[PDB]
Ligand SMILES: *[C@H](O)[C@H](C[C@@H]1CCNC1=O)NC(=O)[C@H](CC(C)C)NC(=O)OCc1ccccc1
């Protein structure tokens with residue numbers, strides 16, 4: 140028993156983290172097969188980063204400007220190319236630790252594990268959820284760029300995120316492994332604002348089901364409400380509207396606890412209207428929305 | 441920027457997780473050099489686990505009763521012995537993934553990373569703090585025993601915990617890697633109650649310093665209080681008394697923020713008396729006490 144924010148084992152990803160150097164800028168890189176993936180702003184100076192012509196800085200570079208280190212072993216860059224916002228540095232050595240992998244792009248509301256890295260050395264691992272405004276609330280300092288987010292389905296690692304920047308609100312933004320940014324952000328140091336965020340409603344309900352599975356039942360009631368009536372209270376509290384699929388995704392959790400999906404929304408509407416009255420749910424005084432229904436089933440199996 | 445509950449990279453520990461089978465009971469084991477460490481109640485049936493004579497069940501066992509699997513490779517047990525509550529199964533093969541390690545016993549209030557395992561396969565990693573009553577609030581299902589807790593100082597892994605049981609309150613208990621239990625618990629399925637817990641005061645202050653470092657300053661005030669006057673309000677709210685060392689440990693965090701240690705206790709005493717008034721600190725509506733001053737410095741470096 141027990142429910143904890145739990146990241147995937149990071150061993151398979153640890154073996155692919157390298158250090159990428161260009162000029163006086165150093166960040167992390169992802170070593171898959173014979174290509175090193177890293178943010179393209181490694182080729183920029185502090186001069187360039189306000190409004191760089193990434194295409195212009197790249198032509199004036201060549202292979203020996205990129206110092207790639209896999210631990211203490213120096214990797215020889217035998218080629219370079221740019222895919223959107225990601226630099227692809229082909230190296231002579233095929234990474235022997237390369238796991239079965241996929242390049243996936245996740246949806247807002249889904250979760251993934253972030254392996255924090257600095258100078259090509261993993262520092263820590265934690266879970267993050269892609270916010271509806273395509274940001275994440277992580278822990279990134281200077282030199283953290285190149286650290287990747289990932290999920291594991293079986294023995295395959297589904298890479299889904301690479302860190303690039305931090306927004307003025309203390310939130311973080313990045314791209315998928317093909318260099319395409321999550322959200323309306325650009326890899327330049329200008330005034331960039333994230334859109335208005337909202338609470339992932341289906342995640343709160345799945346988290347409430349995890350509480351019932353673990354013995355937390357004080358918020359439960361006997362009354363119900365309709366899906367079109369619950370969307371009325373959700374629009375008031377900056378919550379996402381609930382769809383029939385979202386109910387179907389919450390199917391197994393509703394069956395394991397014997398609590399209909401719409402029954403839990405009635406408790407959620409009470410929790411939003413009446414507050415929580417200074418009590419806790421799974422050790423939280425707030426409604427948590429960073430646990431997908433899959434995350435609950437994986438822990439409460 | 442950003443502060444997140446962050447576990448250590450689990451790759452070095454992943455390479456030592458095995459599966460240990462005895463009869464119809466299967467749990468996890470720690471493969472270090474040529475010894476497999478696992479909880480001794482693997483030799484017990486559901487019959488035996490109420491009040492077992494672990495010394496009696498062990499003599500009636502021998503090597504071929506222990507099926508050890510390192511992935512798909514079967515390990516040959518060439519010997520067995522008991523160290524308190526831990527079974528030491530010597531195997532013929534030296535684990536080639538054995539990292540530099542230490543067998544450490546941690547103090548209540550300190551943190552460590554738990555690598556959740558099932559059938560010798562790592563499932564997830566998360567941080568836990570040893571509660572003052574020698575329990576941890578983790579995520580353990582059936583078959584999770586043998587999973588270890590650990591810290592990493594440099595390239596050395598300081599193993600500090602091995603899971604054994606779950607208490608009636610949903611909390612978990614285990615031993616150090618020498619088989620000595622944390623707290624007044626025994627590896628038998630009887631009525632066992634954890635002692636009354638208290639809030640780690642020095643951890644709350646260090647967590648409040650992490651909030652100031654990350655831009656959260658609404659709880660700050662200009663007034664102060666003495667260490668012997670703050671211990672008066674702490675004893676009221678089931679908080680631990682604060683010592684001069686604890687202030688000295690909070691030294692660097694007090695210097696980085698320019699906020700004296702006793703100044704933060706005044707805000708904490710206000711937060712305990714006046715509540716938080718429906719606002720948040722680092723995304724939390726509760727005062728968090730599972731971050732050591734070291735954990736803050738490591739993330740807010
Ligand atoms: C890459 O390692 C770095 C990660 C940042 C550092 C602070 N927090 C992070 O997540 N990214 C940048 O420095 C980035 C580079 C641009 C070319 C995209 N710029 C950036 O994040 O600017 C805003 C900022 C900088 C420093 C501290 C806080 C915010």
Ligand SMILES: *[C@H](O)[C@H](C[C@@H]1CCNC1=O)NC(=O)[C@H](CC(C)C)NC(=O)OCc1ccccc1
Pocket residue numbers: 140467481484489580581582583584585586603604605606607612626627628629
């Ligand atoms: C070992 O894998 C297992 C871990 C338990 C399973 C439930 N949560 C855990 O952390 N330990 C036991 O089953 C343990 C064995 C004794 C010989 C120490 N007994 C135990 O935890 O009993 C209480 C309990 C059992 C099942 C569910 C909840 C509590």
